[PDB]
């Protein structure tokens, strides 16, 4: 019985490879992607496979180096790139991985010598071989040999064709140290490229996640919010179990630090509460301002944030709570009594409240224009927002951009291949 | 990497040699450090006192790999002094020298179409490395490649001496002019 | 003989682009 599932599942690979070879000389990026997807969901599905991969065309380990040794190009690259899938999915985690990487190095040696149909199929499957490199790495430990090779290959990426997985791998190296490596992103700033094709469309969101992370490290919320939200927008797949929970944790903690108070009606996904409820507790504490409860929840949930690379952020928010609260008070009224606001925010005394308001004048909540007299706190929000002159630019340039984004049109009429 | 910038801030020729050692040892493993120290390295660029003054251009060329500016690599090679020829082949040195060679060919055609003379000669090291690579081709005995460089170089001297690539005159040596007829237009 | 291949590829490229601009102009004219 076991053979039958294998006997049905491990044969369509031959048809896919035949199609790949046939289109190789046709040339790629229009048929390869489907084969890559098939490879992926075969890998999730994963014996006699090493014997069946024996030299499909002529004109475990010994099975690995038997084919080429026997009667012997993109198809060869794909075969050399997918002999480690069995152990990969099985994740033997033994030295067999140390038996696998040489195949990767050999594949790396093979692909480097190739070159651009290779740059359109082998180049991208290079992405998944790098994924395996990192996996094989983290299994034992991080290493920059991959980093060195990637940096070298950046110039080639600068050649005719470019994949952007390399930026993702560099971010992987950064995060390996995590809170320790901060110069890496400093480099990534200048080294940043366009890669606007976004052909994978998953690497873009992936890198956006860690870009938001690094930006948040320096508390640059004004743009961190938007980048993190945009990243979350590009995640159609399920990616539920422990995959997007981290992204949500980062986004919500950043938002709470900025001053906005979210409510779980937003996400409340079934498969998040069990892991994200500590943030619910802390946000509930913050909205009120119960410092005692805040430290209670902090010391209770010492881990998670410590294990999620966000402990420092909450530790610093533990004093930004005051600004978080004052945002609402500044928003509501239009002429505040300094003493009254001091009482509301349980501040020390009038001079303390005045100083806090001044400190909060900076940028953000509408200007206070404190008069330092009976007027106390003015907080005179700008008016005339009525699509009139005052929102001349405000309600014109918005539409100007919203319409200049119509380049989707020109893209659409530049897309039609209309073969023959 | 902070040692790199910290050491460079120090002023001593031995300090410069130590910077040389570390930077040529690590070119891309630490890139933003040199990326920001571009100022110090380029001010050292022009200094007769610096024993390794040409090594400043060497640094420019080597560690501007991220800096895709082609002209940057061109001037880096021009100031390289000695190491440009030595770097026959490596990970990316071969790429930059090949780019320099193509740019030199472009300049040669550009200033050769100028027929009245007074053509601004290019930095000597550039044609030196061009001829060195021509010699490598002669060793490889790639007559077609050599003549192609000669014509794109717009220099009839290399075109003439390319006949020594194999010195048999079966075909191309005496019959590639037909190929030239087919694929050229400049009367 | 990669040199000849590159040369003919360049010739094809220039011919293709001139054809393209001509077609653009012709369509523009035909609109009127």
């Amino acid at each position: 019985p076991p053979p039958a599932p294998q006997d049905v599942e491990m044969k369509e690979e031959a048809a896919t490879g035949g199609g790949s070879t046939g289109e190789a000389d046709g040339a790629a990026a229009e048929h390869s992607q489907r084969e890559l997807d098939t490879v992926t969901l075969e890998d999730i599905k994963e014996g006699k496979e090493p014997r069946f991969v024996l030299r499909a065309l002529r004109m475990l380990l010994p099975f690995l180096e038997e084919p080429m040794d026997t009667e012997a190009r993109p198809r060869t690259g794909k075969a050399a790139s997918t002999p480690l899938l069995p152990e990969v999915e099985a994740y033997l985690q033994l030295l067999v991985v140390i038996f696998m990487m040489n195949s990767k190095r050999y594949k790396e040696a093979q692909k480097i010598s190739d070159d651009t149909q290779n740059r359109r199929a082998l180049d991208l499957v290079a992405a998944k071989c790098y994924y395996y490199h990192a996996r094989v790495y983290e299994f034992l430990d991080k290493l920059d040999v991959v980093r060195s090779f990637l940096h070298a290959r950046l110039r080639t990426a600068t050649l005719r064709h470019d994949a952007d997985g390399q930026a993702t791998l560099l971010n992987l190296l950064l995060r390996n140290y995590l809170h320790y490596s901060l110069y890496d992103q400093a480099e990534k700033l200048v080294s940043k490229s366009v890669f606007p094709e976004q052909a994978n469309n998953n690497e873009w969101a992936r890198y956006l996640y860690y870009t938001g992370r690094i930006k948040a490290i320096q508390l640059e919320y004004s743009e961190a919010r938007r980048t993190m939200t945009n990243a979350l927008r590009k995640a159609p797949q399920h990616t539920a179990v422990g995959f997007k929970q981290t992204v949500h944790k980062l986004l919500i903690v950043v938002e709470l630090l900025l001053g906005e108070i979210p409510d779980r009606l937003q996400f409340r996904q079934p498969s998040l509460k069990r892991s994200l409820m500590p943030y619910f507790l802390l946000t509930q504490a913050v909205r009120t301002g119960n410092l005692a409860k805040f430290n209670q929840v902090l010391d209770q949930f010492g881990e998670k944030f410590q294990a999620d690379g966000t402990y420092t952020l909450i530790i610093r928010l533990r004093h930004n709570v005051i600004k978080t609260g004052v945002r609402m008070i500044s928003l509501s009224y239009s002429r505040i009594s300094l003493a009254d606001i001091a009482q509301k925010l349980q501040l020390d005394s009038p001079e303390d409240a005045e100083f806090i308001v001044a400190k909060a004048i900076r940028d953000g909540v509408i200007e206070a224009s404190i008069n330092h007299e009976k007027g106390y706190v003015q907080s005179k929000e700008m008016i005339d927002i009525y699509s009139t002159r005052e929102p001349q630019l405000a309600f014109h340039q918005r539409i100007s951009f919203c319409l200049d984004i119509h380049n989707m049109s020109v893209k659409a009429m530049r897309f039609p291949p209309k073969s023959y | 990497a902070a040692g790199i910038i910290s050491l460079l801030d120090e002023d001593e020729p031995q300090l410069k040699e130590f910077a040389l050692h570390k930077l040529n040892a690590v070119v891309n493993d630490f890139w933003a450090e040199i990326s920001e120290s571009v100022d110090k390295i380029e001010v050292l660029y022009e200094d007769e006192g610096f024993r390794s003054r040409q090594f400043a251009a060497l640094v420019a060329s080597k560690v501007f790999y991220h800096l895709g500016a082609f002209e940057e690599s061109l001037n880096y090679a021009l100031g390289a002094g000695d190491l440009f020829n030595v770097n026959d082949n490596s990970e990316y040195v071969e790429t930059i020298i090949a780019k320099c060679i193509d740019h030199y060919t472009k300049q040669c055609v550009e200033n050769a179409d100028l027929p009245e003379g007074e053509k601004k000669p290019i930095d000597q090291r550039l044609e030196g490395i061009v001829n060195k690579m021509f010699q490598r081709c002669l060793d490889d005995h790639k007559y077609k490649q050599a003549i192609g460089i000669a014509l794109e170089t717009r220099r009839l001297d290399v075109f003439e001496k390319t006949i020594l690539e194999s010195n048999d005159v079966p075909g191309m040596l005496a019959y590639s002019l037909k190929l030239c007829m087919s694929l050229m237009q400049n009367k | 003989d990669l040199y000849s291949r590159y040369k003919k590829l360049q010739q094809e490229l220039e011919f293709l682009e001139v054809q393209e601009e001509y077609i653009k102009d012709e369509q523009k004219n035909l609109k009127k």
Binding site: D115 | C137, I149 | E12, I23
Partner: peptide, 30 residues
């Protein structure tokens, strides 16, 4: 065997997408 003379060919072949552009505009003209 300088690679200078074996990269421009790949460059032009990649650029040939102008062929597909010509096809589409020819379709419009037709």
């Amino acid at each position: 065997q300088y690679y200078l003379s074996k990269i421009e060919e790949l460059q032009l072949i990649v650029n040939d997408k102008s062929q597909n552009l010509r096809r589409l505009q020819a379709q419009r003209n037709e």
